[PDB]
Structure 1
């Protein structure tokens, strides 16, 4: 109820409007793909930096990439669990059960694609 200049800013409003979570202009698969790509690309960062094999060149990036892929898979499993255990009962298709399942599938597809993209960028 308490409106604030930062919450009601038009720049903030249009920045949150075109986000994949609040766009409401596409299938949940595309939003999940974008979410997985972005979050996997950022999550690969701390893993290629400070892992136990960070002193060993070459293998550090590979180990961090598989750790990021495992974290992405764990997040996808928790997303699927939340979708199955949250929307099991009675206009946005994301809030639906199978819509959230498709969102989770897009999320894991985007996560592995972003992990592979981060591996390519670190190799180059």
Structure 2
């Protein structure tokens, strides 16, 4: 009857997160820590480029296979890539105004990392950091949409 799995977060039963296998399994925490969002030491512009490449490559698919011009053979990929470009641009504007809105207060409380060593604050959560993050997001998103078009053009088994 030993070996309980569910634990409170960092041992604190009053914070309210209840560290759980979906939260803090070694593989899951490893994967989430390796994501460019949580690389708080790298420049936010490059993490934004990577995130934007991913998101601009994935969100072309729906516009391509389900857009209004999905059934005309060659116009479909062009239309969906232009639509994904527009959506990426909209998201970049969203990120810019979010950086205008959020980063004005500079909260003074520190950050630890569930093991005691007081890490620094992520430069991403600063006005200049989020500005360059949205810049990287725009660049990477448009590049990822363009490459999605390219992959529709060049991949062998693209049905």
Asked if these proteins are the same fold (TM beyond 0.5), I'd say yes
How large is the Cα RMSD of the aligned pairs?
A: 0.9
Normalising by structure 2, what TM-score? 0.75
Which structure has the bigger radius of gyration? 2
Larger CA deviation: 45-54 vs 86-95: 86-95
Residue aligning to 1:70: 86
Residue 71 of structure 2 is aligned to residue 55 of structure 1: yes
How many residue pairs were aligned? 124
Residue aligning to 2:101: 85
Structure 1 segments of 4+ aligned residues over 4 angstroms from their partners: none
Deviations 1:37-95 (A, max 9, x none): 00000000101101111111101100000000000000000110000011023321001
SS in 1 for 2:138: helix
CA distance in 1, matches of 2:69, 2:85: 17
Residue aligning to 2:142: 112
List gaps (5 residues or longer) in structure 1.
Answer: none
CA distance in 1, matches of 2:84, 2:95: 16
* Greater helix content: 1
Q: Do the aligned partners of 2:48 and 2:137 also contact (CA within 8 Å) in 1?
A: yes
